[PDB]
Design a protein around this nucleic acid. Sequence first.
RNA 1: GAACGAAAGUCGGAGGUUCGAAGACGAUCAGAUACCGUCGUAGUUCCGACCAUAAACGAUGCCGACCGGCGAUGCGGCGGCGUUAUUCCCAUGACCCGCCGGGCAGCUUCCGGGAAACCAAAGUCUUUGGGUUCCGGGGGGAGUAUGGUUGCAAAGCUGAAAC
Lengths: 222, 25, 129, 125, 97, 215, 81, 55
Amino acid sequence: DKEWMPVTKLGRLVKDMKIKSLEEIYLFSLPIKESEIIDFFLGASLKDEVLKIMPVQKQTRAGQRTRFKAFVAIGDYNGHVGLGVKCSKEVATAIRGAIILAKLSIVPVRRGYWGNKIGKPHTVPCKVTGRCGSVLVRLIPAPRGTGIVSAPVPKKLLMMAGIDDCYTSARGCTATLGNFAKATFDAISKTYSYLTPDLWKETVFTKSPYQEFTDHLVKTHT
Amino acid sequence: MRAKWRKKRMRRLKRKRRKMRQRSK
Amino acid sequence: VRMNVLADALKSINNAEKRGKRQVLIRPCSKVIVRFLTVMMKHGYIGEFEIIDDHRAGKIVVNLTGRLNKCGVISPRFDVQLKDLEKWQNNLLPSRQFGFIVLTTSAGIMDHEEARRKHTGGKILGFFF
Amino acid sequence: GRVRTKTVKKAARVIIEKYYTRLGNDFHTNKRVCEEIAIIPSKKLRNKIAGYVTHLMKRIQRGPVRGISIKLQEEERERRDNYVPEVSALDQEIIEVDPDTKEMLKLLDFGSLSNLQVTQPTVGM
Amino acid sequence: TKKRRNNGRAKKGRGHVQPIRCTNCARCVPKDKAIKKFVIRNIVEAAAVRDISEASVFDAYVLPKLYVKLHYCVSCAIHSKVVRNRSREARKDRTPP
Amino acid sequence: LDVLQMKEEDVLKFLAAGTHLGGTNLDFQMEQYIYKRKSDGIYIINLKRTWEKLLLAARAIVAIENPADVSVISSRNTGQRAVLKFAAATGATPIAGRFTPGTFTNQIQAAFREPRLLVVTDPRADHQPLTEASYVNLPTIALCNTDSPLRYVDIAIPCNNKGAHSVGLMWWMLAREVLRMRGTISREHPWEVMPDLYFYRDPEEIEKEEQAAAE
Amino acid sequence: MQNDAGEFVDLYVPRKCSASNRIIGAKDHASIQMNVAEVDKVTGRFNGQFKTYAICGAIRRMGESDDSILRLAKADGIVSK
Amino acid sequence: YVDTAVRHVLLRQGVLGIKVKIMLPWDPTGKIGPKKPLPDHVSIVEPKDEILPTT
RNA sequence: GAACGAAAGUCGGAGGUUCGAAGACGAUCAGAUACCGUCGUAGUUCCGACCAUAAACGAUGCCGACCGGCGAUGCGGCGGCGUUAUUCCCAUGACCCGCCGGGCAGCUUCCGGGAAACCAAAGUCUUUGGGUUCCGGGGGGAGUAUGGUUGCAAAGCUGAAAC
Ligand SMILES: [Mg+2]
Ligand SMILES: [Mg+2]
Ligand SMILES: [Mg+2]
Ligand SMILES: [Mg+2]
Ligand SMILES: [Mg+2]
Ligand SMILES: [Mg+2]
Ligand SMILES: [Mg+2]
Ligand SMILES: [Mg+2]
Ligand SMILES: [Mg+2]
Ligand SMILES: [Mg+2]
Ligand SMILES: [Mg+2]
Ligand SMILES: [Mg+2]
Ligand SMILES: [Zn+2]
């Protein structure tokens, strides 16, 4: 029941109702600033879980000061998940900050097949990898109905990512979630970055939404 | 205690045990 | 000193792909290398290539595309029987649909997909995807 | 000891940003204008803010000040420039520069009007 | 870990550098590691040059200069106030003014 | 093309401003722009490939639809004078001097824009918009010298950024081509004022001295 | 990517770069889509018709984009002879 | 501006000192907060005047 | 399996400048045999042999390819009616500019690695395979004990177990 307070010109295009889907934003890789844009595009992406709230310390002159570091994994089950890290002096403040930063750092997930082209994809398109710290996480394609064979935290993450079937291989300190979950995030973010043998042709090069609806942005800016 | 002087005192103990073996062959 | 010239070629190919250059200078020339690049041309990952025929040993210049993620040479050239290629499928190729493995068969330099239809098998040079 | 606080200077900058036509060069007038256009509880704070407002007025009326720029100051920046003499836009029709650009004007088709003969040694750097 | 890329001295090509004795505490240090400078003074302090100039036989025809190779080591040079410590970004610097 | 070619008045203006001379240090991506070295360290920049990049920068600027989506930056005082009367003339939005990092990243400050094209003067003096370009996804046109880095740069124009006459001639002739592309000024029509506005003004010592001499 | 039924399965087909032929990622903020418009006849009138040159993040960071735009438009014939 | 209370709590470990200080909000009309404004809080007005110049 | 291998140490021949293990005193110290000072043996020198060890370091095996730039240095080669040296064409000399081959190097960098420091190698490593040699599997016990082997000896090499 609050005004969106229009800003950053991308949300102003959204409130002018000109970009129909978040797919058009990920075509052009435009930066996002506020968190309610994907809440406008997605009404069921509120499925999230806090992973670990661990305390970190700073040794001051007499006593150590504490602040809690919250990890929140959000995601809609169609293949759009996000990870949010936020350190703050209060519990619910750190949780809200990690939720907002996960809404900011949501990415799409590419879904492929095991080798039969039936429909409703369930797995990664190829064997991908992700590195954060020393944590190398490898995602391997799986047959239909295999499941997610991993630790519970990236099992929940890939369950939110729409990947019903995948194989995992982790090396390094798997015990630290702040590197292991981000390495899994890099591994699921490289899925579109992988060069694939079915995108040979030059793309259509559709117009920018700024060029398409410049005049609405002019009459809302002036 | 330095590793150098630990090695030299074990070396002196080695020389003492060698002289003990020469004393009772 | 100088050995595995197909690996010497594919290291320059790999570094040119990771740098983002257009064309590669490769100082050895083997008929192994020529048929290897012929298979890569036939599958379309690379482009036109010109072999400057020197009197001693020429130089291959391959016009790159930008497609090659990773290509390399398996070193000792293992002797591979059929009903054992699935180990190399699960070890080398990033998926079932993608990638190819170069099987040196008894009738020439062939492909992983070509070998199961020719029903010959043989050695493995490397892989490209 | 006039090294007054950032809150004092920032309040005076808000005053000179919002209201410029109301202010003059007189302290006794600007102090009274500030008590109509703002709410200041302390009389010493009134005097401090009005003194820095008079100092900003003496800076702005004499020269350009980076710290704030209203639309009237933008029009003054437009006004300061347009008086353009005609002395050194283009010289007389004899220009001598370089034998390298002489060779450039010989290769790429242009006039190559005047003569060019300048030789320098290799005592560069 | 490493504190310096040069590991203190400037030995990179060769393997052994001759030790040269220090001045204050007299310790043999290799010459690429020891603080090696060249002090150039007047032979008389400038507050006493004027007295010798007034009481000199010649009419200012002699002005000697004292040149000394000064050779400290880094263990006593910090105490001798030459080679004061710097920052991590400040260790990349050159000849001070 | 055939009408976008340089003319004798254009090469008279370029050789009178003296923009053909550049820096003493080379760059590995400025190799095809330079033609021949010269003695005493000065290196000669050509005019044809400079004019072609000027033409493409003019094409890219006229290719915009909103004039507010083009921002013009210069921090050095030889370009600060040119920016204010450049961007307020035809089609852009000016900013000069202290860039205040955070102009395009965070949104707590009212000095926040969303540009779709950027033209800067000196990369070495404006390295910070070159850094902040990646978070905004904007192209970059720069008036580069032979000793300037080319990171986050799309269109480079080889020139001399030290000479104020060169800087003013580049901004003036850039706007002069932009206006003829937009259709304000015809092709066979000279400009109404001599470009010293974009060059420079020495302040009121010799300015008022030359005024009192011209009384 | 298609199935055996022949449907368009993929959510979005990303932009392949016009310099290095690499797929621009979704979070790859260091990419750019340059826009340069066409030029008319002897009169020299501006056209609304434009062409798009995609430059990706590693090319933009290494600085290959400066030579890449000219060597890409040289095949078009719009930059030079 | 600040209501300050210092109290004791008697538990089995001994006495426990509690100090509660509360900064009151500025309420110019009402008995809830102080009517006097803060001396550091400088309150300016909005731009007031508008259109209709000469004729 | 073998040749050299710093310094110190051992066995012969010559002397003995300086320094100087030990040793002797004089000082500080509650306590000093140490740090400060004085004398001074072995040694520090050379010629014959032995010992084969170090933070013997770049704490980074050797050979071969690729993957940025810049300013420099040294060693050869090439070009430059450029500059200066003999008496004067003939030739090397010195400075200046640029290139080439391997070398000791330095600055920056998102090319990438790595935990980071940092590295054009410590990169081309889950997108994992150029050839080859030697070593590491928690810290101690312990580079110790017992064997074999070299040495005049000090010791060197190989080198476990219980707990
Ligand atoms: Mg010791
Ligand atoms: Mg230390
Ligand atoms: Mg050594
Ligand atoms: Mg109490
Ligand atoms: Mg010796
Ligand atoms: Mg004897
Ligand atoms: Mg003595
Ligand atoms: Mg003693
Ligand atoms: Mg003895
Ligand atoms: Mg050893
Ligand atoms: Mg070795
Ligand atoms: Mg030489
Ligand atoms: Zn000393």
